[PDB]
């Protein structure tokens, strides 16, 4: 039983970027609804609480239970992580992002290919590129589905995930790739 995206709506939140977990070379909106990867010399104040080596930051609130939707746009990116993890995951170091390992996430790895973080990763069909992705977490039936808003269909949902504990979002924009990947990643108002 996966929604239908206009139900999934319904349930929309409002998620805001951690900008004190995040990775030192990423710059945020003073909305804190986008985030970017700037230049090694473009950097946060550092602290033990940081993301060493993985381009990521975490959403708020942090939740365990009900149903749970937001949205991000992605636009002409060629590169980008967005899903949903843990609150206990670890930052120090490219932990393998597994459902094991408390990370569900969807991830463009470059023009036209995309994949699921199942393991192995699930390489996904997808035949017009979203320009903005819908993330919906079912706390109680342990499911989480992404949506392609822009095409208003489904592209994958992990299931039987047996949540426990709290869940956050969480987001890469990926690497810069020659200046081509430099947009960032905008949490958007549903519509």
Same mark, same amino acid.
């Given at each position: 039983?996966?929604? *239908?995206?206009? /139900? =999934?709506? =319904?349930?929309?939140? $409002?998620?805001?970027? &951690?900008?004190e977990? =995040?990775?030192?070379?990423?710059?945020?909106?003073?909305?804190?609804?986008?985030?970017?990867?700037?230049?090694?010399? *473009?950097?946060?104040p @550092?602290?033990?609480?940081?993301? &060493?080596?993985?381009?990521? #930051?975490?959403?708020?609130? !942090?939740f365990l239970?009900?149903?749970?939707?937001? *949205?991000?746009?992605?636009? &002409?990116?060629?590169?980008?992580?967005?899903? =949903?993890?843990?609150?206990?995951?670890?930052?120090?170091?490219? %932990?393998?992002?597994?459902?094991? $390992?408390?990370?569900?996430? #969807?991830? %463009? %790895?470059?023009?036209?290919?995309?994949?699921?973080? !199942?393991?192995?990763?699930?390489?996904?069909?997808?035949?017009?590129?979203?320009?903005? #992705? /819908?993330?919906?977490? @079912?706390?109680?039936?342990?499911?989480? !589905?992404?949506? $392609?808003?822009?095409?208003?269909?489904?592209?994958?949902?992990?299931?039987?995930?047996?949540?426990?504990?709290?869940?956050?979002?969480?987001?890469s924009?990926?690497?810069? @790739? /020659?200046?081509?990947?430099?947009?960032?990643?905008?949490?958007?108002?549903?519509?």
């Amino acid at each position: 039983n996966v929604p *239908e995206l206009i /139900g =999934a709506q =319904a349930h929309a939140v $409002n998620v805001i970027l &951690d900008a004190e977990t =995040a990775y030192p070379n990423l710059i945020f909106s003073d909305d804190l609804k986008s985030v970017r990867l700037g230049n090694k010399w *473009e950097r946060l104040p @550092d602290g033990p609480q940081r993301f &060493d080596s993985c381009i990521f #930051v975490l959403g708020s609130p !942090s939740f365990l239970s009900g149903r749970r939707y937001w *949205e991000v746009e992605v636009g &002409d990116k060629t590169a980008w992580i967005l899903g =949903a993890c843990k609150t206990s995951i670890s930052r120090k170091g490219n %932990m393998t992002l597994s459902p094991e $390992n408390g990370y569900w996430v #969807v991830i %463009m %790895m470059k023009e036209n290919e995309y994949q699921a973080s !199942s393991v192995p990763p699930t390489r996904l069909l997808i035949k017009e590129p979203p320009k903005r #992705v /819908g993330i919906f977490v @079912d706390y109680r039936v342990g499911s989480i !589905s992404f949506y $392609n808003v822009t095409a208003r269909s489904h592209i994958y949902t992990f299931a039987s995930c047996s949540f426990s504990g709290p869940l956050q979002p969480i987001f890469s924009p990926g690497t810069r @790739d /020659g200046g081509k990947n430099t947009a960032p990643l905008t949490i958007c108002p549903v519509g």
